[PDB]
Structure 1
């Protein structure tokens, strides 16, 4: 399209991303090519948009491309890399050349860029018999100092090197280090810039959007490298990071396409919290009753009787935690096979505003879908916009299933009626 249409398309994601923190793990290959000026520029822009940036790069591949040309062969283990003194020394060289060239590339074509001693490392030690020598993992990250630079508006640049209190230096694994830094900062987003296009499924298809479970279950059959991504992306989510993303850093302007279109072009991973939602039974009736009574009493929910719940308990879903129930929601069916109706949606006032509402609606929508329903009605007297704001369009008596149009007239509430269309 036109410039304007594209700019307006990006606007909502610009809104979201603003004043948010984003930790980028970057493959060290991308710091050498012509792939460098391009992505320095894209990072520049990210800065220009009020995004707080932390950047970490790896060095494994450079190290190896020096081992190879040297006669030496690299040993990895549990996926990590045995780093001797000489190659630890070469990684400090590499970090100096990559940071300086990223800087030059960042300056010409003035964004404040900063670096410091934020990471303290300790040696991974020995694994399965094998000494990881100078392979480190992060022991203690200085979260305050970093916030402080990011507060100032500075982009933070981190090499894959931590220091120990014995005055030693340890090579860090970029992929797990970026995950750990993101967890410390509670970053809204962790972005891994790799050399592939996201993460594939069994047969060839690039996985757009994945839950942590689904990612988890891809890994059973996936190549070891992408196995390590997912495991680090899973641990990050579990640690607090709202969203992790895998892209191809080599594919021109991929970074921008991911962040600022509904599409994206790589893979995106997110963890739903635990939300036991189960089909109700006669045991739950006093609980639903207690929850729902005061809302009836206030005119928010249609009067009911215990008889109705006894005889209708199979259209009810409940949301529980540690036994106790915090929500419920019903689905009514009708003579018309295309229609459903979500009713008696409620959540404890004390567990309100945490997404329980949304999870119950989702659950009933999947329940409705799974039985052929393509039009979900909601009839509400004081909560219409909650539904309006979640895909429900305004409707009318005459659009309702015949019998419901009946009960609507004779119940007297003059509630607002809404429908949402559900597809294949």
Structure 2
């Protein structure tokens, strides 16, 4: 007997163990692909990030934005070019990359978090030398960078005070030249720097499948040697290789867990953190 309607409450109460498990922990999310393209997914990502902060965790958003860049390159008469995964980026292209990622996309994210009620602060690597860039090993592709160093001093106090850093993947040379860095690898390095509990890559895939020709042979949990074996067996292929490499490289530096998850589904973040639903593969440095 006898009143009331929603029990949001029982579900709320059931979230306790998960809330308890990651209290105060740092979570670095690489936001891109479909989660960034489609409006519904994008709104949910912003709501989940705000949720995480509000509930006592420390979300960090890292992003790039290939499609958005392509659109602007088109508007200026430049034709998009790629060399095995990485964007071929000349002086002219680099200017646009910078303007799009730092100026437009970054402030779209900060802006949305702000109106959802979080307090977001947008950086690129060059702000406070958060990320120092060096040229990527791959020659002949212009100003594509590798992360030479990360200095988290600029964002740590902000994190302690409850702000949500939103970090674009562009970073300056030690001489001031901007470089285009792959956002996954920036996310992994920030995670390593922050000694993060989780690195989460929002991805256009279901995770890692053991058999591609068998939709949900989804591998829930892998460790490093196991991941290596999958690469060597070609089970992990194409554009999944750099993603796995990025996870391994981050885990080896002490990040507790790396998640390659399906950003194509609404609320992917909350689904990963607070559910046992199979939205992706966790890769760990342990067991």
Q: Which 5+ residue runs of structure 2 have no aligned equivalent?
A: 1-5
TM-superposed CA distance for 1:22, in Å, is 0.8
1:185 matched to which residue of 2?
194
- The answer (yes or no) to whether the contact 1:29–1:61 under 8 Å persists in 2 is no
1:163 matched to which residue of 2?
172
- The answer (yes or no) to whether the contact 1:31–1:102 under 8 Å persists in 2 is no
Point out which structure has higher relative CO (alpha carbons under 8 A, 6+ apart).
2
RMSD between aligned residues: 2.2
Question: Which runs of structure 1 show a deviation greater than 6 angstroms over 4 or more consecutive aligned residues?
Answer: none
Q: 1:68 to 1:219 in 2, by over 3 A?
A: farther
**Is 1:88 matched with 2:100?**
no
Q: How many aligned residue pairs are there?
A: 269
**What are the superposed Cα offsets for residues 229-264 of structure 1, whole Å, 9 maximum, x if unpaired?**
111111111110110111122311121111012335
SS in 2 for 1:45: helix
**Is 1:12 matched with 2:13?**
no
* 1:256-271 pair list within 5 angstroms: 256-271=270-285
Distance 1:101 1:251 in 2: 21
* 1:317-332 pair list within 5 angstroms: none
**Is 1:50 matched with 2:56?**
yes
TM-score normalised to structure 1 length: 0.59
**Is 1:153 matched with 2:162?**
yes
- The answer (yes or no) to whether the contact 1:55–1:158 under 8 Å persists in 2 is yes
Distance 1:20 1:102 in 2: 22
1:232 matched to which residue of 2?
246
Distance 1:256 1:264 in 2: 12
Distance 1:196 1:60 in 2: 17
Distance 1:6 1:182 in 2: 30
* 1:374-385 pair list within 5 angstroms: none
SS in 1 for 2:148: strand
Distance 1:51 1:213 in 2: 30
Q: Which 5+ residue runs of structure 1 have no aligned equivalent?
A: 274-424
- The answer (yes or no) to whether the contact 2:110–2:121 under 8 Å persists in 1 is no
* 1:178-217 pair list within 5 angstroms: 178-202=187-211, 203-204=214-215, 205-217=217-229
**What are the superposed Cα offsets for residues 138-168 of structure 1, whole Å, 9 maximum, x if unpaired?**
2221122222211111111111111122111
1:59 matched to which residue of 2?
65
**Is 1:110 matched with 2:110?**
no
Largest Rg, 1 or 2: 1
